[PDB]
Amino acid sequence: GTSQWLRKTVDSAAVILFSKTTCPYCKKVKDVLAEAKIKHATIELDQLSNGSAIQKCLASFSKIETVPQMFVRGKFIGDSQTVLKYYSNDELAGIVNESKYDYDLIVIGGGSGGLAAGKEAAKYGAKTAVLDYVEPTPIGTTWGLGGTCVNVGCIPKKLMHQAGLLSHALEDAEHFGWSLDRSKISHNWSTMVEGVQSHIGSLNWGYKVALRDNQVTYLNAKGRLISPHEVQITDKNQKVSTITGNKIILATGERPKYPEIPGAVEYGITSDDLFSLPYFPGKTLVIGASYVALECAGFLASLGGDVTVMVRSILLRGFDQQMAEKVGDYMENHGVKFAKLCVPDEIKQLKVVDTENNKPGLLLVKGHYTDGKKFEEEFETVIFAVGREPQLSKVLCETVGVKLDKNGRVVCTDDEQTTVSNVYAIGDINAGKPQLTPVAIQAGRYLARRLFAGATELTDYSNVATTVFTPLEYGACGLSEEDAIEKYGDKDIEVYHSNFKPLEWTVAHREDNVCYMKLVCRKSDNMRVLGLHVLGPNAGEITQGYAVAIKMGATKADFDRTIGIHPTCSETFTTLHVTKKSGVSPIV
Amino acid sequence: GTSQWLRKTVDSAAVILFSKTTCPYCKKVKDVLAEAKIKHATIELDQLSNGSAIQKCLASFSKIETVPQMFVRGKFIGDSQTVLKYYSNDELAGIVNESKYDYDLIVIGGGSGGLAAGKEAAKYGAKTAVLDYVEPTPIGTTWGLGGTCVNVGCIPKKLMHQAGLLSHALEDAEHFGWSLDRSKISHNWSTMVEGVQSHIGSLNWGYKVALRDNQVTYLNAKGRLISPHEVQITDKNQKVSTITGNKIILATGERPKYPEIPGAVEYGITSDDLFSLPYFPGKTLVIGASYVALECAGFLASLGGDVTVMVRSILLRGFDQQMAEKVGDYMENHGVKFAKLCVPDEIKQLKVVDTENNKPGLLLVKGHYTDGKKFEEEFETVIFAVGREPQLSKVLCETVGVKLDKNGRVVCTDDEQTTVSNVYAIGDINAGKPQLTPVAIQAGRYLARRLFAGATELTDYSNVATTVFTPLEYGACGLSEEDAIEKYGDKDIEVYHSNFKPLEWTVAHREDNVCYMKLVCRKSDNMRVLGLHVLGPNAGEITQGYAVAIKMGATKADFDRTIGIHPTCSETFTTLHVTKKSGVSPIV
Ligand SMILES: Cc1cc2nc3c(=O)[nH]c(=O)nc-3n(C[C@H](O)[C@H](O)[C@H](O)COP(=O)(O)OP(=O)(O)OC[C@H]3O[C@@H](n4cnc5c(N)ncnc54)[C@H](O)[C@@H]3O)c2cc1C
Numbered sequence A, B: 001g002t003s004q005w006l007r008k009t010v011d012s013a014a015v016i017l018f019s020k021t022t023c024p025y026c027k028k029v030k031d032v033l034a035e036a037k038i039k040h041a042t043i044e045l046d047q048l049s050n051g052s053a054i055q056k057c058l059a060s061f062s063k064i065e066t067v068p069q070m071f072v073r074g075k076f077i078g079d080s081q082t083v084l085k086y087y088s089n090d091e092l093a094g095i096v097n098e099s100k101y102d103y104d105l106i107v108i109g110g111g112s113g114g115l116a117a118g119k120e121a122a123k124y125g126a127k128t129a130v131l132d133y134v135e136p137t138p139i140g141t142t143w144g145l146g147g148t149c150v151n152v153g154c155i156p157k158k159l160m161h162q163a164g165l166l167s168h169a170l171e172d173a174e175h176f177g178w179s180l181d182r183s184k185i186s187h188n189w190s191t192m193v194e195g196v197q198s199h200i201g202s203l204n205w206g207y208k209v210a211l212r213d214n215q216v217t218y219l220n221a222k223g224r225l226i227s228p229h230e231v232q233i234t235d236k237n238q239k240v241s242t243i244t245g246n247k248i249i250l251a252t253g254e255r256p257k258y259p260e261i262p263g264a265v266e267y268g269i270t271s272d273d274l275f276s277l278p279y280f281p282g283k284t285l286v287i288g289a290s291y292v293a294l295e296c297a298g299f300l301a302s303l304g305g306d307v308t309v310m311v312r313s314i315l316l317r318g319f320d321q322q323m324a325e326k327v328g329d330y331m332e333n334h335g336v337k338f339a340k341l342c343v344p345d346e347i348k349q350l351k352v353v354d355t356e357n358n359k360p361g362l363l364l365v366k367g368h369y370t371d372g373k374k375f376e377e378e379f380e381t382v383i384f385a386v387g388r389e390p391q392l393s394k395v396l397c398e399t400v401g402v403k404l405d406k407n408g409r410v411v412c413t414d415d416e417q418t419t420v421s422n423v424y425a426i427g428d429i430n431a432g433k434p435q436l437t438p439v440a441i442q443a444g445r446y447l448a449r450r451l452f453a454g455a456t457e458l459t460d461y462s463n464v465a466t467t468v469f470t471p472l473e474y475g476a477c478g479l480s481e482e483d484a485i486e487k488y489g490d491k492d493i494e495v496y497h498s499n500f501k502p503l504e505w506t507v508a509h510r511e512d513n514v515c516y517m518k519l520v521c522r523k524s525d526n527m528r529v530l531g532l533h534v535l536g537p538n539a540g541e542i543t544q545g546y547a548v549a550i551k552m553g554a555t556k557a558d559f560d561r562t563i564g565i566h567p568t569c570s571e572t573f574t575t576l577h578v579t580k581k582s583g584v585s586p587i588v
């Protein structure tokens, strides 16, 4: 309904102008507001098929139907003559700053989603605060503004992956004619960490400057929602106070889990600690088999480490298991050992970490396999990657009424709204959604536009592409082969597949038939592409563009009629022809 | 409609079976042909909409309306009892080999297009010959089977590009913690060339094995079409003879042009000579400004050469000129010199090439700028990259009646047919088509299927993506910005753009705002994407997947609703928002 949209837009927007692009009265009001440095949203009624119906609905509030009409926080302010009179009498600034709450928007959490939502809301005149606080890890690690991805996630992880990839580039360079000897070259962990941490510091600073430039209030304080519109904040000096806000966005993210075994918290570490560790981990055990576990084990092996991965059941649960097994097989042939069907029982300390000279300690890990056989081996570093969890008990008083699911994540509708109407949740704490940085950013930006600029567009969470940055990378978009068969039946699924060899690997004498790709397709729906999978170098660059085509409903015929770019790895998708049902080998 | 297709299919197929997937008599004939090693096309009438009508039309040739029906070279052979009779009496092999011509197909040219067409035709039972001969360059260079891309084009060019990219990987590795010193490392040209040529040699041999295993006759002989069905061949011993073919595919490609100046042929070289040259070119002049010219200049500079490019007018004529200027600016900041608005007049020899000590000669180059000022400088190597041309006078007697355009390329209809009904042309000699290896391969394969398997699908030559492999790579799909404005007018064109920085460049301390991308869109057609452009690392991997979405009619909204993969370069296409008309800076 047009009238329900208009009622919601008026009640929600901080400062909004209803306009037409061809009206010189509307242009004149825009110029007044611009000169007054008053930020606002604008709706151009002449670009909307229902613009005339909107004009009649506006008279509900204003008892006029003409354009322009200015609103502030649910209340009609005036037409052109009224707005210009307030300005000429120096009354306009006071009217547009009048609010019942301290802020139009309070964002709890200053990470991927929360910073994006706060910056976007401020563009439309929402008076906005962003709260961020980083509870230290058990050994004391903490960091600055920007969230998990910036400080202890995608950003440092991919930079250390790049340092690992450069090991193989140095080797390949000999074959391509360069005079170096890879056998005589080693890696300095502390030099890498110093550069990674210096880049992260520039990002912390840039986010502070960006908030100041958008007139967003940044508070380095711990927030707790105690009623629908009240947030209790605790200072760095432990001073406690309360601020109020009209809309609330919860964006507090997750932290790593520890297993409930003796010694884990005291003597192990997680990804939170790894990316700033001042000593090389040395002989390392990674416990777990998530993409975090395998990414970290992979680059530690390429940087000279002796690395073992302890796997409870399978690798990359939730991902296509043919692809997961090929990922691990490459890792095992390139220096990662696996202890399969095995879990830990206790971590004992044999030597304390030498903080003065930057050397790891020594640990005795005891565990057991599923048959019953015992595990016992010494490691210098033990990294836990056994999942991540929110801690919303700290963030959210139970009496507010925001409903959580059985894992402690927020139950939201398709507009990110919680069970309390003015409170929203974005990012990793939103139950059921893919836990990825560009998802959090899109959700936050799009939500701010609906609240403060009358937008209607929702975030689309389907067929979101992924890439696992293991030593040989794995990109995917859509269904695994096993999920497609479960949903539609084996007789309705056709799979096209092929190995390939990067041209860069020929002169370098690397493997002929390890890189692999496949398209999982539905026969009865014009051979629709249900899922795309690729194992190879630069897999995130390969996969990204196809995600647009899959959103558009690409079929196998759409891939066939498109011409390849030569020489690339990605062009192999344009000539796939071997089906799995045919039994013909996929090798090159 | 159906009747015209059936007549064309029956007349041109070598061996074809009309069948139904469920009929055990058709299965019986299939098993017989498989046991006899008789290759054939198959049309399954039950899987075609007009299958019932086709069956009734078949009686115009066979006088029966049932399946199976087997035909050979336009003649009905029999149903199941009849085919079994021939096999039982050892008569079937002679029947399926009866032909008025020596071959069903003669392919003149064994490169990208011709090898693809010959292998595909042989799969359907066409008796096929492929002719290939490599006329030596002026200094005597020759090479093996596979054409321009394999021997003196895309394959060696990208391998030498990779050797050049590794110079920056060695530099970057220091910042990521590796102990090498790039200052102390040098490149050995001849070690590179040895590895490149070993890979090329494996491709030459692989193509010979592939033709042998597909029962294709390979003749290392120069061919000349002297009438619609007669090809005159000259072998290695200058023996001349004539072979005949039903269908002819011309696929003889192009070779480099030389300027008509004194000394050019005697003392300069082209890309044909570069990729097997036994010595490093040294101080080099590249004359020209095509993608061949700039790609070669770029990797020679990265491999330690003192390189200059002589540009007659503009860089990359035919490509988006904003992008071309950005490509050249990067090369100029990374060690390539440019002599702009300049042309050569003569090449004089100062030193003969030193075969004793494996060293280039030395040359004096005289030229002039467009204002008349003189150019005079000494170089060890002069490379001409001033275009490529066919020389179809050698391939084609004018009395055959095959029409050529004003540049000497073959004028074809949209099914690759020439003005002579049994003669077809594919690849670089087909007038007006993009001159790229995957285009030649698609055209050859799809043509073979139409001639010998009853296919109707044509090759689509629109919006074929490209990548220029300069030191910073340039990928593109669709229209340049200036071509879009010329076609639709400035007011109907909206351009979104952004700079970006690869994450890999941060710790390596490389440039902040050199990489660049834009989408050129049509306002009045739902903001349709007319052209996509990207300058950055791995640009061919970035561009390829978007070529599918553009083929499908992607709009700007399709890019916006798609979620990025983080951290990648390609994800920057999913969040573009700055327009050129706004005047807002694209830097980040
Ligand atoms: C090792 C690792 C690698 C990853 N790699 C990738 C990758 O390659 N690609 C990808 O797309 N995603 C990746 N991710 C996931 C990505 O990091 C997350 O999806 C993203 O960070 C989630 O953003 P968010 O806004 O939901 O939360 P966060 O970024 O976690 O931000 C929440 C912030 O709120 C703070 N906070 C918590 N409680 C309070 C409170 N009471 N008051 C104030 N502030 C509070 C937190 O300390 C934090 O600063 C990775 C994650 C990890 C752990």
Ligand SMILES: Cc1cc2nc3c(=O)[nH]c(=O)nc-3n(C[C@H](O)[C@H](O)[C@H](O)COP(=O)(O)OP(=O)(O)OC[C@H]3O[C@@H](n4cnc5c(N)ncnc54)[C@H](O)[C@@H]3O)c2cc1C
Pocket: A565, A566, A567, B108, B109, B110, B111, B112, B113, B114, B131, B132, B133, B134, B135, B146, B147, B148, B149, B150, B152, B153, B154, B155, B157, B221, B222, B223, B224, B251, B252, B253, B254, B271, B292, B394, B395, B426, B427, B428, B429, B435, B436, B437, B438, B440
């Ligand atoms: C330096 C360079 C770089 C390139 N890089 C790329 C790139 O990155 N990507 C891309 O897609 N394309 C690239 N190309 C273009 C690509 O090489 C061509 O488009 C492709 O090779 C054309 O194939 P074709 O089958 O038409 O001809 P060709 O591959 O040239 O094959 C024709 C063959 O026929 C032979 N022949 C000629 N006359 C006769 C005769 N009378 N009898 C018998 N045989 C004969 C020729 O000697 C040759 O072997 C590049 C080209 C060059 C020169």
Ligand SMILES: Cc1ccc(CNC(=O)Cc2cccs2)cc1
Pocket: A028, A031, A032, A035, A084
């Ligand atoms: C750029 C800008 C915009 C507004 C003002 C303030 N008032 C006027 O200019 C008065 C007028 C009303 C109608 C026509 S002029 C000053 C400067």
Ligand SMILES: Cc1ccc(CNC(=O)Cc2cccs2)cc1
Pocket: B031, B032, B035, B084
């Ligand atoms: C599976 C298979 C494969 C080849 C053949 C060849 N044809 C015969 O042997 C002739 C007959 C056998 C039975 C009735 S006619 C037949 C079957």
